[PDB]
Write a protein that binds this ligand. Sequence first.
Ligand SMILES: Cc1ncc(COP(=O)(O)O)c(CNC2CONC2=O)c1O
Ligand SMILES: Cc1ncc(COP(=O)(O)O)c(CNC2CONC2=O)c1O
Lengths: 382, 380
Amino acid sequence: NDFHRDTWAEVDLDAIYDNVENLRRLLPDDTHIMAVVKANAYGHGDVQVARTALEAGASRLAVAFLDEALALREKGIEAPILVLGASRPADAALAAQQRIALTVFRSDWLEEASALYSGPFPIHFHLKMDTGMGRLGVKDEEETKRIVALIERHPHFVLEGLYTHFATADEVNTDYFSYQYTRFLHMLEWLPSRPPLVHCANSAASLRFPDRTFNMVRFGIAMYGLAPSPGIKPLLPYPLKEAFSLHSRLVHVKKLQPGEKVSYGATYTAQTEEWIGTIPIGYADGWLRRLQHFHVLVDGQKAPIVGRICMDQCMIRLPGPLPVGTKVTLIGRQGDEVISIDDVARHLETINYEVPCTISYRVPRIFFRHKRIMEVRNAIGR
Amino acid sequence: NDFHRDTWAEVDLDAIYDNVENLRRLLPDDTHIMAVVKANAYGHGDVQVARTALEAGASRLAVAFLDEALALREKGIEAPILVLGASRPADAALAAQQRIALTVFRSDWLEEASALYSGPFPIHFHLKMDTGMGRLGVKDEEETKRIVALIERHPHFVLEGLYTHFATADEVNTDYFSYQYTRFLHMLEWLPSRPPLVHCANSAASLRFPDRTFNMVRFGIAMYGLAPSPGIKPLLPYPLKEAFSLHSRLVHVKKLQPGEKVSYGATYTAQTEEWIGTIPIGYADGWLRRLQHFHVLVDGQKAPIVGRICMDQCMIRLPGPLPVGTKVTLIGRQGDEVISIDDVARHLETINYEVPCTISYRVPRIFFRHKRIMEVRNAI
Ligand SMILES: Cc1ncc(COP(=O)(O)O)c(CNC2CONC2=O)c1O
Ligand SMILES: Cc1ncc(COP(=O)(O)O)c(CNC2CONC2=O)c1O
């Protein structure tokens, strides 16, 4: 595959192998790893991360909605997929044919699905319990038993799992974590029998309490080498290896004289004789406007973004006359200097999760494995 | 195509047609309209919008970089396409074979392209002049002459046009605008012969000063029905129709009791007996975390997003117990109420331009033309 703009993101798949393998070492050999690759593997490339994770020790995959699971099947993944979120009952059939397990949290959904499906393939369900997150999930004993019955009655419906999700697993103070864990324990007793897969843990829960995970963990953010929160970094068992880096190249260089304005709304004004560089990356690439007072790396050095950010390009003050074609690093290392997703996140006033996800389809992903390029994936490619 | 999650964007091509045909009316017969369709047509759909604009009166298209243009060509667009940004000298042969015009602003670029490309297709260049924007463009006299000379001298290189871009055309205060306009008029004299296409205007200068736009207007944001700035709204010649809306549906509804927490970090506490709904849209869909205190529309009413926004889901405080499947409009109209892109931008502390652009590949676009559903585009 190929690309024709000098702006690309690199994803280091060796880092992803290490982060997942270290977890397979840490967890009890009877506890499986469900790798979660929702949102195009948190902006990193769904099938590439999925293949790598399954190599390091993962056995299942998790996604947010049905289209994401089907897209993984089209690209040849044959591992089990759990759709963590909601789906349409009319689609139960397609999920069953493609061997995608579904999350269920309401009986009216199952009432509606028994009526539209009658084999031959089984649909594996994972009942979702709301123990304190307030998002999806059952919250009552009458409703938990109803779902279980409706599932028991249809011959093709199977309860493969049961889970919950924590709202504050990434907080140093485990008070709400404890209420939720204890609540899941009391909620599990409302089921006639324990299904084979009981899971609760995300990355913050499984890296902190490996012994409290039951038999399957749903490992997300830590797979990509990003800490669940800057509150648990010291509490982490093994070092995490960041996989994502973003880069560009200078396409225009010029010296300004004192008094000349730069970019929209002509915000910036040069005060001495300065060299301004232009890079082909802007807000439609996910390098949002709020980053206008941030900096990028050019030739091992920090250089500020100057003026407002444009849709496809932005300007930066250079140390002096640098050549056109000089690599600029937006996220990554250049020498002794480094800009991490947490740094971008801080400036954007968000969590690290939101950063790779916003780097758009427009920006190509180059995959590295065994310190060499494995494939290029340009979404608007030929 | 089709999609399997109840979150979708709707693009109204009729709005997009009217915004273009009205400028086609307001501009001279001589003057072309170049529809700017970069960034997947500002998040509205590249082919769908390109096609609609050409039907409405546009004769040319513009894109940001080479991959966006090759993508239009692969989808059947055979109308002219200018790449407004930069490209590699080594890709001038590809641009040529696919009939894509390129922006030029540096002499060393040409020198390099001249070594690498010998023919047989011609390559049409548009000389960019920097008159005050500081982004791309030639600034000095002898750099202009050197470009003209390197173009004149090569058998397959043609200078089809030249242009500039205004930094403050959306600004009420036209003082930097008139400095740029004057600088341009002056730089045009460093050229022996004035080329066939001279263009300077973005949407704002083309709707504000249609006569002082020469023979080609680049038309962007306003095509999508969005004003260039809040300051320019009551100075525009016709009403713009808004093309983009975003919808979702309730997938869970629950009554929460007081002292009960909602979402990450448990930062929302239920104070009364509240009905809470979950919708399948979140920050990976471009509905950013910062929209946490914002109002969406459910059943004709504003309803707040309560608790933190998740990757793929978020929660809202419902007026009462509504059925699962109820349509929630995040951008758009629900009876009596409207949320515009300008509203979303206000809360995210940005400009409208940024909004449809971040609504991600994950969100299908349903297109309407002639008041009927034309097409569904689902990226994954
Ligand atoms: C049910 C479920 N389990 C596991 C994960 C992944 O856990 P980590 O990526 O923290 O290791 C997610 C991601 N859900 C997200 C991610 O961000 N916001 C959300 O609601 C999820 O929804
Ligand atoms: C050269 C050029 N012409 C026309 C347009 C579109 O004009 P409007 O969208 O204002 O009607 C742009 C968008 N350039 C942008 C947009 O945002 N940041 C940029 O650098 C452009 O770069």
